[PDB]
Design a protein around this ligand. Sequence first.
Ligand SMILES: Cc1cc2nc3c(=O)[nH]c(=O)nc-3n(C[C@H](O)[C@H](O)[C@H](O)COP(=O)(O)O)c2cc1C
Length: 362
Amino acid sequence: EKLFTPLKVGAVTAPNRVFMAPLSRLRSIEPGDIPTPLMGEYYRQRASAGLIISEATQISAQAKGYAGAPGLHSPEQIAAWKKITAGVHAEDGRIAVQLWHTGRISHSSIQPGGQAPVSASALNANTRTSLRDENGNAIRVDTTTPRALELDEIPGIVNDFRQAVANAREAGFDLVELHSAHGYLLHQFLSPSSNQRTDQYGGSVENRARLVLEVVDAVCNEWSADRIGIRVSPIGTFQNVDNGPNEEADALYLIEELAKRGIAYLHMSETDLAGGKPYSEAFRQKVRERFHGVIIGAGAYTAEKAEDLIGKGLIDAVAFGRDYIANPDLVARLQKKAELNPQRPESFYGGGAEGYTDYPSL
Ligand SMILES: Cc1cc2nc3c(=O)[nH]c(=O)nc-3n(C[C@H](O)[C@H](O)[C@H](O)COP(=O)(O)O)c2cc1C
């Protein structure tokens, strides 16, 4: 068994390889998109994880696409996150903040000034996001057609990521995870399906990856490379964003570029919740030989699959999502081979303590 052995992950050392995947639970305070003491308790309950990766967190107000998702741009948000990271650290845990811009997966009603959200191009995502109704309950609503970012707006986006990472450091996070997956802003630029730009930020894979790599360079400079992770989902289709006709070659280009920056980790979201074709061992080997930091696998993993791939030297750790929703002490349960609590999907998004902090530990 290798799941319960330590792993150096950039600036910190995880005592085990059972990581908590980033999970939007949409329970923040509005107005202000502010983390809450209840969120603090939820994360504290899970502090035995090798590493906690937080729910996706806005780099800016414009970044917002979901009602109830927290930010890390305002003083009030920084102060609230400080309490949450202190709680995790009080229990000898480690926590990374996942930072995103939702781009076109958003709605005008939650944008600054109530205006259209932004993206690489001006075509609708043709999906839904989650807002709140008049009583504060999560509701699904069709995405608003975006405006294409103007070329002179791109530096501001890079700066917003940079500033959010500065803020993450002050808030006491151990690492940051850039959300470059699942059809959100960075992935919108990466994918040819969502990027029809004719400037240097569209066309070739070099142009499509230009933005995410500018962001990686900015955040490594702001803090340190050993503090930076990135989540990608470069094979398959996610939230209507596929990865184009040369997805494998384009993925390896991006991974080679990321490797040059010497960042802490590469987190691969292998499938959407609806499923997809499995990664081949050949492709995993091609990834492994290009990236010289920690590789985290994710997507419907079992402990058995995690052990198999860690044992083969293809990944270093596994992030569990839904099992972590339902099992605060997932590490102890997997170590002891104990049964897991049943999941209650109706309370994954929005609401309060029920379905959030009421899954018991052993
Ligand atoms: C309720 C819920 C919220 C999620 N929120 C995020 C998120 O904020 N960021 C992210 O990268 N992935 C998010 N995902 C994807 C998970 O991180 C994970 O990749 C997915 O649940 C598959 O892994 P699992 O089979 O271990 O649950 C979310 C998944 C669920 C079920």
